[PDB]
Design a protein around this ligand. Structure first.
Ligand SMILES: Cc1cc2nc3c(=O)[nH]c(=O)nc-3n(C[C@H](O)[C@H](O)[C@H](O)COP(=O)(O)O)c2cc1C
Ligand SMILES: Cc1cc2nc3c(=O)[nH]c(=O)nc-3n(C[C@H](O)[C@H](O)[C@H](O)COP(=O)(O)O)c2cc1C
Ligand SMILES: O=[N+]([O-])c1ccc(O)cc1
Ligand SMILES: O=[N+]([O-])c1ccc(O)cc1
Lengths: 188, 188
């Protein structure tokens, strides 16, 4: 059931590294992105998938100093996770679409952002089906350059979000929902 | 399989009205939105679901004249569908979040757009699981006011997309995919 899959996906902050099959996890991440729709089939999403030492480096050597340097002028729960999936949008593709179809120039950035949300939650949900939890963070644009430098990423990759994932060590908290009447109108 | 569900969702342009259980369709649309994540659980998405006479009115009395009036200075494939789901984002909620958390003021519009993509494709995919096809159009902002007037929608609902849906009358066309090596980087 697809609806059940959606419902199974939740924000999980308590994450560990009790992950049985890392290759399957990577395969599933790629498939979730692969089968996600994008305007003009532009496929503007780009991923950096960090685990092990790279996961440690991101949070200890990049995020923490950047935050501390920023503040002045506990992230250990994130580091404890199995990995982080950093989602970017390729601005070179966006810009070329704007040039090729000048009529829709304003739309491509919008559709690109929508596309980021799309692939982020599809991956999030696919991981949840594997029994893994995740949470979505936004330390961009603060960590952008350090991440690009560390992993030699093209300048055209615009960081949009970081999905931290791993074994579920504590359940999701409570969540409320709007009144249906306030967000759905059905007309015959 | 969630991955299979993703793969089953495709753009279908040839749509009909051979829909067996309209109530189940409506239920599924609501559930897909309900169980979609949004920043701060803000639930900014709003839907207008048109079928029957309303579906006819949208395309004959709103979209076509607006387009023709615009051009001067065939949509029948869309009208032939069973319905249209118009996705909006509530700007009143966005603006209140900007006020309540001024630090993240710039992020909420971005996260709202991402949220629109998210609920759009979750609905799209849930409909596909029911055996229904759909396609996603963008005649906003051209039809915005006419739609708001016709169905008495709040001014704060910002139209983002229109998902046309119905029975599949012809299969999806061919689609290509990027090289994995050009969009996924895995680091240990
Ligand atoms: C576009 C988007 C941005 C989000 N930003 C953050 C964030 O920066 N930090 C965080 O901890 N959670 C973030 N969230 C998680 C939401 O708060 C969470 O999904 C929502 O409260 C619903 O809870 P659930 O994910 O358990 O279903 C974000 C979710 C979405 C869809
Ligand atoms: C954010 C977004 C905007 C899109 N805009 C349009 C559009 O305006 N008109 C249209 O016919 N298809 C539109 N598409 C459909 C894409 O072209 C289509 O999803 C992509 O080519 C992949 O094909 P598929 O949907 O069969 O998987 C849009 C898709 C997304 C995700
Ligand atoms: O014709 N159009 O306006 C389109 C067609 C496809 C698409 O992905 C976006 C816009
Ligand atoms: O603390 N934060 O920065 C947050 C927390 C939750 C959220 O949905 C967005 C931002």
């Amino acid at each position: 059931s697809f609806i059940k899959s959606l419902e199974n996906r939740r924000t999980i902050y308590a994450l560990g590294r009790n992950v049985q099959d890392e290759e399957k996890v990577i395969e599933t991440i790629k498939e979730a992105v692969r089968f996600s729709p994008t305007a003009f089939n532009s496929q503007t999403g780009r991923l950096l998938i960090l685990t092990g030492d790279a996961q440690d480096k991101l949070w200890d050597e990049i995020v923490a100093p950047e935050l501390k340097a920023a503040m002045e002028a506990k992230l250990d729960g994130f580091k404890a996770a199995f990995g982080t999936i950093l989602f970017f949008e390729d601005q070179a593709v966006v810009k070329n679409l704007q040039e090729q179809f000048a009529l829709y120039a304003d739309n491509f950035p919008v559709w690109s952002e929508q596309g980021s949300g799309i692939i982020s939650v599809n991956v999030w949900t696919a991981l949840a089906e594997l029994g893994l939890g995740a949470n979505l963070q936004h330390y961009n644009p603060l960590i952008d350059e350090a991440v690009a430098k560390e992993w030699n990423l093209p300048e055209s990759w615009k960081l949009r979000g970081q999905l931290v994932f791993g074994s579920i060590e504590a359940p999701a908290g409570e969540k409320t929902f709007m009144d249906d009447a306030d967000r759905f109108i059905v007309a015959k």
